[PDB]
Amino acid sequence: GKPLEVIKIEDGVYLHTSFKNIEGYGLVDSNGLVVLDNNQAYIIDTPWSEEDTKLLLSWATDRGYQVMASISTHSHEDRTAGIKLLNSKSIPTYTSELTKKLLAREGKPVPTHYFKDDEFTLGNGLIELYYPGAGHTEDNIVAWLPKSKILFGGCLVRSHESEGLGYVGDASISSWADSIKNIVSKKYPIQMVVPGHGKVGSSDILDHTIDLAESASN
């Protein structure tokens, strides 16, 4: 069969990490966040398994948190599992309108809620969502947390120690550098960047990511 892990990375911000076995390669890890506003919880990108999502919801309800919503950063396979489960529990699920329509076109579970512009904030200013343009996928969005000064980049960003753009099957490689530069133009006072895969780091992760992007489109 290794199980979901949750760890505190700031006050009211927890990193959750799930694991899959890759035959021939080893273990690949995947991150998202739980963000607390008092005792209300928000999930950014659920575990890829419906199983590990189940465990994440229990992680929260066992601490007396009320899970208010989930946000999914894009439409890929691993982001669907949680949507279906949280829909079933009447927990509000959010994506961009575009991500929602992509999911519906692919016959996948759709979120119950969705925002239409390129910016949207959740909680009472707790989570600022932003669509910076195509990169990892055509629809990928990021989440900015103004209080903790953390950017959740998901797979649109690559961690420091990692050396490629990851799964690029649905990527817009020649658009990617420009999309990271759009995040940069927000002039968020970024203190930490959480990638979809790998270790958390500083704002450097964005520069690192443009390097990989600019290299590959050559």
Residues that bind Zn ion (CB under 5 A): 76, 155
Query: Does 18 show up as a binding residue in the annotation?
Result: yes
Contact letters (x/-) for a second copy, 155-184, by CB under 8 A? x--------xxxxxx---------------
- Out of 4, 14, 16, 30, the only residue in the binding site for a second copy (CB under 8 A) is 30
Q: What angle do CA 156, 6, 63 make, to 5 degrees?
A: 125
- Binding flag, residue 62, a second copy (CB under 8 A): no
Sites for a second copy among residues 186-205 (CB under 8 A): 196-198
Phi-psi region of 29 (alpha: psi -120 to 50; beta: other; left: phi over 0): beta
Q: Which does 22 bind (CB under 5 to 8 A by kind): a second copy, Zn ion, none?
A: a second copy
User: Rounded to whole angstroms, how far apart are CA atoms 174 and 170?
Assistant: 12
CB of 155 to Zn ion, least distance (A): 5
Query: Does 155 show up as a binding residue in the annotation?
Result: yes
Minimum CB distance to a second copy smaller for 25 or for 62:
25
Contacts with a second copy by CB under 8 A lie at 21-30, 48, 76-78, 155, 164-169, 196-198
